[PDB]
Structures are given as structure tokens and as C-alpha cells.
Amino acid sequence: GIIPKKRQELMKWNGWGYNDSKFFLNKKGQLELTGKRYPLSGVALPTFKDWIQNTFGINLTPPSIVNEDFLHELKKTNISYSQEADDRVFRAHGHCLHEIFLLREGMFERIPDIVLWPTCHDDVVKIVNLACKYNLCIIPIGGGTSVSYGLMCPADETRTIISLDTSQMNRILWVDENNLTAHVEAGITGQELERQLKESGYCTGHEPDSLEFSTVGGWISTRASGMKKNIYGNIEDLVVHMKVVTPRGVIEKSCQGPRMSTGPDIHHFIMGSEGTLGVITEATIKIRPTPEYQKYGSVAFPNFEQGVACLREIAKQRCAPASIHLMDNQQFQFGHALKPQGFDPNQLSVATLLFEGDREKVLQHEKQVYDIAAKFGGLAAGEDNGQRGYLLTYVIAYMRDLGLEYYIIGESFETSAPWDRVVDLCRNVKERIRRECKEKGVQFPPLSTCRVTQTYDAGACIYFYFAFNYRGISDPLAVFEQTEAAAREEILANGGSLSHHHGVGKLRKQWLKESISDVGFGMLKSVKDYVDPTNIFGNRNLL
Amino acid sequence: GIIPKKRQELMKWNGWGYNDSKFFLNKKGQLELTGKRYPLSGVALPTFKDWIQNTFGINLDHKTDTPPSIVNEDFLHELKKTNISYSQEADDRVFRAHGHCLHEIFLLREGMFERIPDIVLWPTCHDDVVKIVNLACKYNLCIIPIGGGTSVSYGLMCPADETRTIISLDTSQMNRILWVDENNLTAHVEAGITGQELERQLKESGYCTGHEPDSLEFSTVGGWISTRASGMKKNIYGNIEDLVVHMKVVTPRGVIEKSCQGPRMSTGPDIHHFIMGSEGTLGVITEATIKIRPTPEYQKYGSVAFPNFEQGVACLREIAKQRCAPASIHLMDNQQFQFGHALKPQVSSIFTSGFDPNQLSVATLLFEGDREKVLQHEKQVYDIAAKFGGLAAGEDNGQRGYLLTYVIAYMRDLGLEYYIIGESFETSAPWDRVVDLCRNVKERIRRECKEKGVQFPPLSTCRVTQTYDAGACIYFYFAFNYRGISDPLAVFEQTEAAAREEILANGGSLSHHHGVGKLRKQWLKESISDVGFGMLKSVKDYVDPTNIFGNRNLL
Ligand SMILES: Cc1cc2nc3c(=O)[nH]c(=O)nc-3n(C[C@H](O)[C@H](O)[C@H](O)COP(=O)(O)OP(=O)(O)OC[C@H]3O[C@@H](n4cnc5c(N)ncnc54)[C@H](O)[C@@H]3O)c2cc1C
Ligand SMILES: Cc1cc2nc3c(=O)[nH]c(=O)nc-3n(C[C@H](O)[C@H](O)[C@H](O)COP(=O)(O)OP(=O)(O)OC[C@H]3O[C@@H](n4cnc5c(N)ncnc54)[C@H](O)[C@@H]3O)c2cc1C
Numbered sequence A: 001g002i003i004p005k006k007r008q009e010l011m012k013w014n015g016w017g018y019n020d021s022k023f024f025l026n027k028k029g030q031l032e033l034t035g036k037r038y039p040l041s042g043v044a045l046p047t048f049k050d051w052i053q054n055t056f057g058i059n060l061t062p063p064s065i066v067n068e069d070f071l072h073e074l075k076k077t078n079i080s081y082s083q084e085a086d087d088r089v090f091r092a093h094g095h096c097l098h099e100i101f102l103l104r105e106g107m108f109e110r111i112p113d114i115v116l117w118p119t120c121h122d123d124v125v126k127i128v129n130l131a132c133k134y135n136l137c138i139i140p141i142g143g144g145t146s147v148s149y150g151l152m153c154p155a156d157e158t159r160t161i162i163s164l165d166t167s168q169m170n171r172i173l174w175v176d177e178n179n180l181t182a183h184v185e186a187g188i189t190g191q192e193l194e195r196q197l198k199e200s201g202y203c204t205g206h207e208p209d210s211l212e213f214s215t216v217g218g219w220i221s222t223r224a225s226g227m228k229k230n231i232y233g234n235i236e237d238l239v240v241h242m243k244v245v246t247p248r249g250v251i252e253k254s255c256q257g258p259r260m261s262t263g264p265d266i267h268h269f270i271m272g273s274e275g276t277l278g279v280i281t282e283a284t285i286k287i288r289p290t291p292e293y294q295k296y297g298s299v300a301f302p303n304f305e306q307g308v309a310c311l312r313e314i315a316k317q318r319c320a321p322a323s324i325h326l327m328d329n330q331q332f333q334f335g336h337a338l339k340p341q342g343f344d345p346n347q348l349s350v351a352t353l354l355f356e357g358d359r360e361k362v363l364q365h366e367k368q369v370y371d372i373a374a375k376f377g378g379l380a381a382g383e384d385n386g387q388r389g390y391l392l393t394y395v396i397a398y399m400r401d402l403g404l405e406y407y408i409i410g411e412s413f414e415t416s417a418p419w420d421r422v423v424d425l426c427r428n429v430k431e432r433i434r435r436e437c438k439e440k441g442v443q444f445p446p447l448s449t450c451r452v453t454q455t456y457d458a459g460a461c462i463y464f465y466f467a468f469n470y471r472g473i474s475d476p477l478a479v480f481e482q483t484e485a486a487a488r489e490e491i492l493a494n495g496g497s498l499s500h501h502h503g504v505g506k507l508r509k510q511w512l513k514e515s516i517s518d519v520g521f522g523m524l525k526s527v528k529d530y531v532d533p534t535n536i537f538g539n540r541n542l543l
Numbered sequence B: 001g002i003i004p005k006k007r008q009e010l011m012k013w014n015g016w017g018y019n020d021s022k023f024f025l026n027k028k029g030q031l032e033l034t035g036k037r038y039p040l041s042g043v044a045l046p047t048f049k050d051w052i053q054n055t056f057g058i059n060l061d062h063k064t065d066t067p068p069s070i071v072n073e074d075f076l077h078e079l080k081k082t083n084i085s086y087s088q089e090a091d092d093r094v095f096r097a098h099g100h101c102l103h104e105i106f107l108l109r110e111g112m113f114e115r116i117p118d119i120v121l122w123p124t125c126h127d128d129v130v131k132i133v134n135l136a137c138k139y140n141l142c143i144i145p146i147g148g149g150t151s152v153s154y155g156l157m158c159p160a161d162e163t164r165t166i167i168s169l170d171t172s173q174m175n176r177i178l179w180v181d182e183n184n185l186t187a188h189v190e191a192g193i194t195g196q197e198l199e200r201q202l203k204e205s206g207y208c209t210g211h212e213p214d215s216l217e218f219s220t221v222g223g224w225i226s227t228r229a230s231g232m233k234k235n236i237y238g239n240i241e242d243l244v245v246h247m248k249v250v251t252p253r254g255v256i257e258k259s260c261q262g263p264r265m266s267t268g269p270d271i272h273h274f275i276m277g278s279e280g281t282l283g284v285i286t287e288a289t290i291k292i293r294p295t296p297e298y299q300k301y302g303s304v305a306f307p308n309f310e311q312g313v314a315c316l317r318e319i320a321k322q323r324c325a326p327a328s329i330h331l332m333d334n335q336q337f338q339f340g341h342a343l344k345p346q347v348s349s350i351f352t353s354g355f356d357p358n359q360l361s362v363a364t365l366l367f368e369g370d371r372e373k374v375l376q377h378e379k380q381v382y383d384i385a386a387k388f389g390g391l392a393a394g395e396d397n398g399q400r401g402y403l404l405t406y407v408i409a410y411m412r413d414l415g416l417e418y419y420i421i422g423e424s425f426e427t428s429a430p431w432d433r434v435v436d437l438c439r440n441v442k443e444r445i446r447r448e449c450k451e452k453g454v455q456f457p458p459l460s461t462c463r464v465t466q467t468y469d470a471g472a473c474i475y476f477y478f479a480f481n482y483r484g485i486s487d488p489l490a491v492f493e494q495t496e497a498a499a500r501e502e503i504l505a506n507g508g509s510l511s512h513h514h515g516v517g518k519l520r521k522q523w524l525k526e527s528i529s530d531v532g533f534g535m536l537k538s539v540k541d542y543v544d545p546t547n548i549f550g551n552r553n554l555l
């Protein structure tokens, strides 16, 4: 769980995840994941090659510029640092298709000048003070999992850029059993956090698909949302306290009250601030007893529309299981071709379910969902379609790399939307993608798939996957980037949000002002100018 | 429920609630409420008098010019062209010069305010509010919004040295439901609508919000958003921050509004949270989208008696750990149990004063939802309560407590008639501090009162009113007979400030829901840190550069 300083040792320098885990062909011509890390690791997938082929129509460095007297004072602190090219390049990007393309086939315009590794809050304080005194720029990094250009260094930033890496600041400080909270350092990952709590009988239940690398400070910065938010909350519900180092000083509430009325909630000034205001160093998070029992389920529907109506009714009755997804036909089959070993199969849709809690509770809940689903032509579809629909959110980032080795570019994007817009939004957005690809000269209809991933009282989170064979297409990236901007326009035109959880970074900046209004934007600017008047936190996300 | 412009016609000008509802001595010499509004209205309460007497040491036989309107003539000329209703009448202005703190009421009964609004305006829509804010930029005016006037933090008090013309911008005529969306289960409303009228109107379509603060009869959507209001059934429905899905705000800089109605976003820091808790300092909230739910099938009341307060707390904690809190659960201490008891109809004899009865505590419970779920739930909660010595004290005690919430504020006026000053205050605290905080804060109150030369021990009681994962809301009530005391307001105000220190020192917050206003300003920086304070200031300075919104709450 602890990220070592030298990341490339165990992680891919040009891709998602670990070095020891990549899809290859076993000695039977079947796709299989390498290594021993996962459930699916070493598990052969007889059907997956046939799925790719049929679906896509295929066969199968800048110098370190640093002030010498700053550097001298930094030697005195004993904080570990690096000016090595591979360290700096590793931290120059997140996991946008664009950025991954560049790493494989080119170089970044700008990369951090030096990497620093504080181990505690006081080290962060020194670093922020040094950056004030010497006029440095700080971009914080935790997991490096940003999908929003949130870690990209601005091309024209001429100051020394410090990549402030939070990975060695990763302790559980205290677990409070009476209040059911855990106070942690911001660089701890989801994986390591859960491993450690579990040993004491607790969990956080915060499970973003990137939990392996993505950190507590990253979740707060980007307003992260987890797979089981229906039980545990999204990040804004989980956090009860935080400590933040800004150029102006340290933000921290004086007490750990569960809920306050003491003016506008300054925790909300920091959540969603995407590295632009300071460094979150410590956070207090709600914890829970480990669930007794878990069960997967799934449900088939005659079409997408009926499935959507069903999830809505589920949310209306306020009995969503720990997690419920709805997949459209394409994705269902994407998922179906992940197995080892009527209704109109064009439009047939599948919901996946995950229940957790005490056993007779789960079992009693499971019967309540199926009845509700019965009303909408849904029939129980069994456990293992359940399991593997989820593992489809979890390995996908491995698949994207595989895709790239065979001239396939793909990405995901998401929106939230009100319940009465979901059906039209999905249909119109998937179609917009097909139309744009045609018009740009893509020879094969792209993969254009969506799934509903979160329900709320007022609406849903919608996930989209988009991918095409770039065969005899001159410029594959830029076509892609244009198609994805068009899909955003389609999303906003259908009443969807700029983002549900990924965030804005530099990728969705141009839309922020209309989304939050001019004055809204102005309010954000005015906090930035007060807390960080010299713009030390100059990743230039959001504004 | 639509507030008329001239409030004093229906409402007390020197106290809480309606004109037709007050306590009095009936012809049998027993305390009774006049009028018909409440379930207790017109019901004799034989034992109340004794309790007052036993608890306060009074026999109950012993009872007890305005600033000119300064307004610029050309502004006034431009205001006439808008057709926005206004008044410069003294009684309209005095009405809107206060909330419901003890100190303010005392003043209304025995003196006059240093400073009251110069003019009252009644916009009926969002565009009116924009005209008024534009007019105040142009003419250098100051604006204090008011909705229900139920602030208990000095949130509405006009600063004495404010020299500009003060506009009391009254939102009571902005009260419509603009749309009820049944696919999305949301309602879009104008900010001036009251809890009571909002629910009444949703009910006709099959809906409710379930936000029920004790002041719902007067308090408003805009008000709730400004003060971060908390309602009794937040366990089911959420507090104000969970209920609001969208809002529209008018500021001197322009109009704050998100472009979409998504349930949840990651588009930077959530600007809704800049406006919730702003207490009138930034602009007028004009419109808001709120979650609604189908009207619950069935409601059920319950109660449980515990050996002591401590065991009761431990049970509440455990209910929260299993996450099966009823729609509402209150744990009241012994004194409050006994007070409840004084309000039953059975007339005792005049020669007449396995649980120990001056130690036991009572939790009151309310469940709502589908009949079937309610009943499983009820049974589940009692099973837990039993593991803590809890025995069901029955549904009539449950129903009684939940009715008495809306009549308690009328009791304070009664007390003031007989030389008794009292006030409530609240805090939120971590689970592991609740027991000590309650004990120490109550004991601090007694010590303070004795040391300030109060003859008779004060009423010093508490209840736990909300449970959360991380803690609880605790509600205090504090009251004493001030006969013989030289400076009673000063004594009270000093005691309440010591209780507040005693609260902070025991791990509790500055406020769970009443908020800061001008009453708790001195503690804010330390509560939120200097930089936290700094950040709020920077938004105020951007959104309201010339401090048009000049009630001076918070900062
Ligand atoms: C395969 C994959 C799956 C994903 N699944 C999910 C998901 O389920 N749910 C979800 O919400 N997101 C998901 N994401 C997006 C991303 O993981 C989240 O936004 C994550 O929270 C970012 O955390 P991190 O530690 O990697 O932050 P980083 O990538 O390291 O940084 C993100 C932003 O936060 C700033 N920042 C980071 N740390 C701090 C700090 N401590 N103090 C101040 N600023 C800081 C950075 O400067 C940057 O702007 C996924 C991404 C990938 C690639
Ligand atoms: C007996 C009693 C019981 C109470 N019970 C509760 C309770 O259970 N829960 C709870 O949370 N509170 C309770 N309160 C406190 C109070 O009702 C709440 O704080 C409520 O939110 C105030 O709303 P209001 O409409 O009366 O606002 P007002 O007092 O009229 O306004 C309060 C503040 O908000 C401003 N304001 C009003 N409208 C707007 C507008 N639309 N835009 C911008 N600013 C505005 C005012 O200028 C002032 O600063 C109680 C008060 C009393 C007296």
C-alpha cells in the first residue's frame, strides 16, 4: 500500500497500474491478466479476444531549473527530494488518454523541476514557507490518478515547479473507537487505509475505482465519489475534519462536532479546490464496523428504459443496495465476454447489485429489490453477472493500454443528471459520439456505451465509454479530443452536469463559468487571491 | 400561512407567536393557553402552577420617542415607480428590528432599540429584489433581509453606528411554489415561504419536505439556508444542506446560480456552501429547489424510560452505531421528564407533593414511513433500548412531548410576566464528550447563578435532540427568577456566556443550528481558524464590496 519514492520500480511509467499486471495472450490464444495481484489475475478469458475483434474490426527531457540557496536551505530540513528526470516525468501527468499518448510517443512541454517528499504536516509547513521566501510554484501530487489534467504543469510557468508528493505522509494517527472516526495523514491510499482499519475491525467503505493509488488528500481535492456511497457517503459526508497548509497559514476548525452552524462551511471551500489553494495534510474520516456479509446480484431488463425506470423506483423507495449499476446492452456484453468458460438482445439491459451488512438483512433486502424489479419486467439474472459487471469498472484501465497496443483509443467520462433527463441524455450522447466519429472519418462505428452508476434522490451519475479503431485515420488523438468535447456539449445540452466526480482540472475549465455563474466563479477567485496571493499553487486548475 | 404585511395584527409585537395564544390563569386558578391553534390550546393544566412554584420559588401571585425615518427623497421617488410596497411606519419598523433572544424581548417590553430599520420593503419576486439591490448600490443604502424574524442570535439587530438608511427587506410576500417536479422529487420555491405553508401546499399534491424546525410556523426557506437550519426529522429528510438542490441569490455583484440541476457535482468548491450559513451578509436568497418526499403512510410515537441519563446516552449512541435512528429521537434528562409530568390534566391533592424517579431519563420517539417498515423499525429500536435498562413508557408520553415543542416558546413570555427569565441554547459534540459536557455545563450554570447572587437554584436542564455518526446535538434550557437582582439582563447574559465557555471547553461546538449572528461573534475566529475567518471575509468583500448587507453577523 505505501507508494515507494521511486514509483517506476513497481508501477508502469507509461500506463495504468503495476508493472506485473497487463493483459497478454496465454498459451491457448486467450486474453489473460499477468501476475498474482487480483482475482482475475491468472484467470483466462476465452471469449474476450472474440469480443474485441468483433467489436472494433481488428485482428490481434527538460533540465532541472532550481535556485541554489533554496536548495541549500532544503538540505537543512532533511526532507528527501529529487531532480532526476524519471521522478519528475512520472509526476508530470495523470491518466488522461492525451497524457498517456504523450508518454508513449513524445514528451511534455513542462514537468516539475524538483520532487519533494514530506512525511508530516510540519514538513509541509516548511515547504510552503520556503516557496513563499523563494517564489516557487507548488503542484501537489498523491496518487497521480487525476483524469482531468489536474497535475499538468502550465507550459508558460517560468518559476521553479515543486512537485510536492504526499506518498510518504501516510499514517493512521489515531482510530477513535468511541466516535467511529479515524484521523489520518493525507497521503495514505484507499487500499492501505482499508488494510490498516480492517486489522482493528473497521472500514471506511470509500471505494473509488482508483483506491489502490488514490489518496485521502486527492479525494478531498477532487470531491471523490466511491462505489458504495449509498452506505458510506461520498467524500463530503465522510470527512469530519481536515488541516490545510496555505501560504496564508493553517486552516483548521477547533472542534470535532458532527454538524455545525458557524457560517459558511470552510470545509467546502477546500473540497473541490483541486490543488489550487494549499496542501491538505491531515483529515478525520468516519469509519464503520466491517460488514459481516456481502452478496452480488444482477437483473435483466427488456431494454435500457425499463432498467432506468426501475433504478428510479429503487431510489424513490430509498432502498438502493450498497451499489447498483445499470449497463446498456453493449456494456452488458462487454462484461459478458469477461466470463471464464426471451428479450430483444439488441436493447436488453442488465443491472448489477452489491449488498453488504448482516446476512438475513442482505437476504431480506435482496428479495425487496427483485420484487421492485419484477414490476418493470426485470428477472433475476444471477450472481456471477453481478460480480463480473463490477470487475469491469475495476480492470478497464488495464484494458485501455491493451487497446493502445492495437490502435484503439478509448476513454471514459461522466456526468450527473436529473432523473427525468437520464434516458434522453444517454441516447442523445451515445448517438452524438457515433455521428461525430463518422463525420471525422472514422471507418468503424466507435464503441459508444453508457452505464448508470449512482442513484440519488434527485438524479443519477452516468458513465460513458468511448473507443474506436483509428485505422487509416491520419490524426487519432485530436479527432478523439474533438469528439469528447462534442460529447460534453451534448451532455450539458441534455441537462447534465460538467462532472459528477472526476472534476474540472484544466480539461473542463472552459465550461466552469456558465456552470457555476460569473459571481460563483468570482467567489472562488476571491478565495484563491486571499489564501494564495502570489499563486504558489499554480497548477491553474478550475480558474 | 401567508404572512400579511402588518404582522402585529396577528402576531405578538412583544413576543413569540400568535396574538390569540398566551398562557393565563383560568377561573379555577390554573394555567391554560387561550385560543384554539394548538392541541393544548383551551386545555387546563392543573399541576403546572405547582411546578412553576416548586421549580422557581415564586407564588405566582406577583406580575409585572421612536427614531425618525431617515430616507433620501430621490431614492424614494424611484421606489414609487417600481410599485414595490413599502412602509416607514414605526410599528412596521420596530417589528422587524429584532429576533427572539431574551435580551431583545426584554428590551421590547421595557425600553427601545438603539437602531431600527428606516424603511420596510416587500418585494413579491426575484426581479423586485434585483431592483432593490440595484437601488441600494445607487443610493448607498444598507439592507437587512428578514423572513420569519425568528433569529435567536441577534442576526437581525441593526448596528447602532450604522449611519446609512437601513432597508428591512421583508421576504414574506415572496412565497410561491414555482413548480413541483414529480419525476425528480423536487420543489422550486420562493425564499420567503414558511415551513408551515410550504408543507400545507405540498400535502395537497401528496408531498412534503419534512424539514420541521420548531419555528416552522414562521421561519422560512431563505432563513433556513442563511442560518444552516436543522429540523426535527433530519434523520429521515436531511438538514438544510442535504435538502437544497439549487438556489438563486441576488448580490450587489450580480446573481448567483448554478446552470444545472444535477444531484451531485465535482465542479470545484461547492458555492452553495458559501451561501449556507451566510446569515444575511452577502445578499438575498430569492429562490431554491428542495427535495420532497411522498407523505408518510403512518406515524407512530413511543417513549422509553432509562435508569439514568448516562445509560440513555449510551443507548442513543448505540442506536446511531447501528444506524437505525427513528425519524426523531430525544433523550430528556430527569428535570425535563418531571416538567413533562407537570403538564398532565389530573388534579392532585393539596396535601400531597423499579426505577428511582428523580434519576430516570426518558427518550421520546417518533417513527414515520410505510406501516410495515415503521413497525419492524419500532420493534428493532426497543430491542436495542432494552439492552440499556430501557422500558417502553408508552405512546401517549411520546405524542405529548412532540406536541409540547411548539408551545414551549409561549412559556417564556409567561415566565417573564412573573419575573422569570429563560433561554435555550445548543451545541453539537462528539459522542465521547456528551455525558461530561451535559453534567459540567449544567453545573457551571448553577455555580454562576449562585455566585451572581441568585437566591434560588436555576432551572438547568438538557436534552439530546439529534444523533449523528460522529456525535449528537445537545439542547439546554436555562431559567431563573430574577426578583431582587439589580441588573437581571447582565446577570443572565454573563451566565449564558460562561455556559458557552463551559461548552467549548468540553469539546462542544459554537453552534449546532442556531448559528452565530452577532451573539457568538467573539468565538468565531478560534472556531474556524484565522485563515477560515479570512476566507469568509474575502467572499464578503468580493460579493459585497460596499457592505450593503450590513447586519454585521459573523465577521
Ligand atoms: C482507473 C481510474 C479509476 C478512477 N475511479 C474513480 C472513482 O471511482 N471515483 C472518483 O471520484 N474518481 C475516480 N478516478 C479519478 C481520481 O482517481 C480521483 O479524482 C482521485 O481522487 C484523485 O486522487 P489522487 O490521490 O490520485 O490525486 P492526484 O491525481 O494526485 O491529484 C489530483 C488533484 O488533487 C490535487 N491534490 C492531490 N493531493 C492534494 C493534497 N493532498 N492537497 C491539495 N491538493 C492535492 C492535485 O494537485 C491535483 O489537482 C479514477 C481515475 C482512474 C485513472
Ligand atoms: C422558538 C424558536 C424555535 C426554534 N427552533 C429551531 C430549530 O428547531 N431549528 C433551527 O435550525 N432553528 C430554530 N430556531 C431558529 C430560527 O428559526 C432559524 O434560525 C431559522 O432559520 C430563521 O429563519 P427566519 O425565516 O425566521 O429568518 P430570520 O430570523 O428572519 O433571518 C435570519 C437571518 O437570515 C437572514 N435572512 C432571512 N431571509 C433571508 C434571505 N432569504 N436571504 C438572505 N438572508 C436572509 C436575516 O437577515 C438574518 O440574518 C428557532 C427559533 C425560535 C425562536
Ligand SMILES: CCCCCCCCCCCCO
Pocket (backbone or CB within 6 Å): A052, A147, A209, A396, A397, A399, A400, A402, A403, A408, A409, A410, A411, A412, A465, A466, A467
Ligand atoms: C479494449 C477496449 C478499450 C475501451 C476504452 C475504455 C477506457 C476507460 C478507462 C478510463 C478510466 C476512467 O474511469
